Design an enzyme around this catalytic site. Structure first.
Site, mmCIF file in Angstrom:
data_model
loop_
_atom_site.group_PDB
_atom_site.id
_atom_site.type_symbol
_atom_site.label_atom_id
_atom_site.label_comp_id
_atom_site.label_asym_id
_atom_site.label_seq_id
_atom_site.Cartn_x
_atom_site.Cartn_y
_atom_site.Cartn_z
ATOM 1 N N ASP A 1 -23.088 -3.360 -14.467
ATOM 2 C CA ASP A 1 -22.589 -3.297 -13.250
ATOM 3 C C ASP A 1 -23.059 -2.067 -12.043
ATOM 4 O OD1 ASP A 1 -20.400 -3.517 -11.282
ATOM 5 O OD2 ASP A 1 -19.044 -3.901 -12.810
ATOM 6 N N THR A 2 -23.497 -2.694 -11.128
ATOM 7 C CA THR A 2 -24.023 -2.098 -10.078
ATOM 8 C C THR A 2 -22.963 -1.542 -9.071
ATOM 9 O OG1 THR A 2 -26.334 -2.526 -9.537
ATOM 10 C CG2 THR A 2 -24.736 -3.533 -8.168
ATOM 11 N N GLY A 3 -21.779 -2.067 -9.507
ATOM 12 C CA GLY A 3 -20.655 -1.387 -8.452
ATOM 13 C C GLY A 3 -19.738 -0.634 -9.052
HETATM 14 C C1 0Q4 Z 1 -16.164 -18.185 -9.265
HETATM 15 C C2 0Q4 Z 1 -14.720 -17.503 -9.829
HETATM 16 C C3 0Q4 Z 1 -14.745 -16.861 -11.041
HETATM 17 C C4 0Q4 Z 1 -13.514 -16.642 -11.644
HETATM 18 C C5 0Q4 Z 1 -12.810 -15.143 -11.230
HETATM 19 N N1 0Q4 Z 1 -13.700 -14.182 -11.752
HETATM 20 C C6 0Q4 Z 1 -13.058 -13.134 -11.807
HETATM 21 O O1 0Q4 Z 1 -11.837 -12.659 -11.785
HETATM 22 C C7 0Q4 Z 1 -14.051 -11.936 -12.322
HETATM 23 C C8 0Q4 Z 1 -13.977 -11.787 -13.715
HETATM 24 N N2 0Q4 Z 1 -13.795 -10.627 -11.600
HETATM 25 C C9 0Q4 Z 1 -14.737 -10.007 -11.029
HETATM 26 O O2 0Q4 Z 1 -15.752 -10.549 -10.996
HETATM 27 C C10 0Q4 Z 1 -14.359 -8.890 -10.342
HETATM 28 C C11 0Q4 Z 1 -14.458 -8.753 -8.785
HETATM 29 C C12 0Q4 Z 1 -13.469 -9.770 -8.012
HETATM 30 C C13 0Q4 Z 1 -14.388 -11.334 -8.145
HETATM 31 O O3 0Q4 Z 1 -15.553 -11.258 -8.494
HETATM 32 O O4 0Q4 Z 1 -13.752 -12.148 -8.239
HETATM 33 N N3 0Q4 Z 1 -15.355 -7.928 -11.062
HETATM 34 C C14 0Q4 Z 1 -15.019 -6.586 -11.242
HETATM 35 O O5 0Q4 Z 1 -13.621 -5.952 -10.831
HETATM 36 C C15 0Q4 Z 1 -15.969 -5.390 -11.650
HETATM 37 C C16 0Q4 Z 1 -15.880 -5.284 -13.073
HETATM 38 C C17 0Q4 Z 1 -15.463 -6.481 -14.076
HETATM 39 C C18 0Q4 Z 1 -16.337 -7.378 -14.235
HETATM 40 C C19 0Q4 Z 1 -15.768 -8.707 -14.891
HETATM 41 C C20 0Q4 Z 1 -14.502 -8.712 -15.113
HETATM 42 C C21 0Q4 Z 1 -13.485 -7.737 -15.057
HETATM 43 C C22 0Q4 Z 1 -14.043 -6.568 -14.382
HETATM 44 N N4 0Q4 Z 1 -16.022 -4.266 -10.949
HETATM 45 C C23 0Q4 Z 1 -15.864 -4.278 -9.687
HETATM 46 C C24 0Q4 Z 1 -15.559 -2.870 -9.036
HETATM 47 C C25 0Q4 Z 1 -15.973 -2.787 -7.663
HETATM 48 C C26 0Q4 Z 1 -15.712 -1.444 -7.057
HETATM 49 C C27 0Q4 Z 1 -16.578 -0.935 -5.734
HETATM 50 C C28 0Q4 Z 1 -14.041 -1.507 -6.797
HETATM 51 N N5 0Q4 Z 1 -15.764 -1.694 -9.756
HETATM 52 C C29 0Q4 Z 1 -15.062 -0.962 -10.594
HETATM 53 O O6 0Q4 Z 1 -13.893 -1.761 -10.713
HETATM 54 C C30 0Q4 Z 1 -15.482 0.266 -11.370
HETATM 55 N N6 0Q4 Z 1 -14.809 1.436 -10.542
HETATM 56 C C31 0Q4 Z 1 -15.342 2.200 -9.767
HETATM 57 O O7 0Q4 Z 1 -16.460 2.346 -9.808
HETATM 58 C C32 0Q4 Z 1 -14.615 3.062 -9.029
HETATM 59 N N7 0Q4 Z 1 -15.011 4.738 -9.086
HETATM 60 C C33 0Q4 Z 1 -14.454 2.686 -7.643
HETATM 61 C C34 0Q4 Z 1 -13.421 3.471 -6.753
HETATM 62 C C35 0Q4 Z 1 -12.217 3.285 -7.291
HETATM 63 N N8 0Q4 Z 1 -10.866 3.791 -6.322
HETATM 64 C C36 0Q4 Z 1 -10.733 3.350 -5.218
HETATM 65 N N9 0Q4 Z 1 -11.487 2.240 -4.590
HETATM 66 N N10 0Q4 Z 1 -9.528 3.916 -4.418
HETATM 67 C C37 0Q4 Z 1 -14.907 0.349 -12.573
HETATM 68 C C38 0Q4 Z 1 -15.854 -0.484 -13.794
HETATM 69 C C39 0Q4 Z 1 -14.946 1.647 -13.267
HETATM 70 C C40 0Q4 Z 1 -11.547 -15.220 -11.556
HETATM 71 N N11 0Q4 Z 1 -10.735 -15.083 -10.550
HETATM 72 O O8 0Q4 Z 1 -10.944 -15.303 -12.594
#
Ligand code: 0Q4
Lengths: 99, 99
Positions: B25-27
């Site tokens: 996770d690049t983010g």
């Molecule tokens: C085609 C649709 C697919 C299905 C769809 N997919 C998802 O929901 C998937 C699982 N979720 C995601 O892909 C989401 C982003 C939203 C999205 O892409 O839709 N991804 C994410 O949320 C990923 C991690 C993750 C991956 C997979 C599952 C769960 C979690 N992190 C994204 C996120 C970006 C950051 C700049 C806010 N990073 C973080 O959450 C990391 N946080 C940090 O690095 C913090 N220090 C940032 C600041 C926090 N404070 C603040 N902003 N005031 C954490 C890992 C410590 C669904 N809705 O079910």
């Protein structure tokens, strides 16, 4: 561009004629942009992440320029703390992770 | 390796004496691991993302081998939905984002 990761990977994007900054995020499946007015139809959706689930507006086939590269696809708009460019758009600009 | 983004970029990591599957996770500024009893002292920490914050325990100087690449740094353990390798560890294996 070969982007190292010492700093957060921030990139300039242009959506709806508007320039914004976004983080290229390989852990995101989709692309979520902060609340803004976007021309078009949109269907209500829910996505989740680390803290949980948020309600977003779903826009299809939106034109978006990421660091000069163009892409046309889905963009979700809602209350994200930061603008995120997910894998649905990163595959369009042919980005890969290398090491 | 070169990882393409059609699917979630998952790799096997090694923490403590166990093998796992984590997402690059690049983010994610930080690295957060699923709940597990790791010997050592820690401090309580709050981490946020999309949807809110979660309470985690913080361990420093942990050694993790990611994709056959050993690194060492802080790991946050908590009820995260997925094992997330962040930039604190990605920079140590020299991973770049290229498009
Ligand atoms: C085609 C649709 C697919 C299905 C769809 N997919 C998802 O929901 C998937 C699982 N979720 C995601 O892909 C989401 C982003 C939203 C999205 O892409 O839709 N991804 C994410 O949320 C990923 C991690 C993750 C991956 C997979 C599952 C769960 C979690 N992190 C994204 C996120 C970006 C950051 C700049 C806010 N990073 C973080 O959450 C990391 N946080 C940090 O690095 C913090 N220090 C940032 C600041 C926090 N404070 C603040 N902003 N005031 C954490 C890992 C410590 C669904 N809705 O079910």
């Amino acid at each position: 561009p070969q982007i190292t990761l010492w700093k957060r990977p921030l990139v300039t994007i242009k959506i709806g004629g508007q320039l914004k900054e976004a983080l290229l995020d390989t852990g995101a499946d989709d692309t979520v942009i902060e609340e803004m007015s976007l021309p078009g139809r949109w269907e209500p959706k829910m996505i989740g992440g680390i803290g949980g689930f948020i309600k977003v507006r779903q826009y299809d086939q939106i034109i978006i320029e990421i660091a000069g590269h163009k892409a046309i696809g889905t963009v979700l708009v809602g209350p994200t703390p930061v603008n995120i460019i997910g894998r649905n758009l990163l595959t369009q600009i042919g980005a890969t992770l290398n090491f």
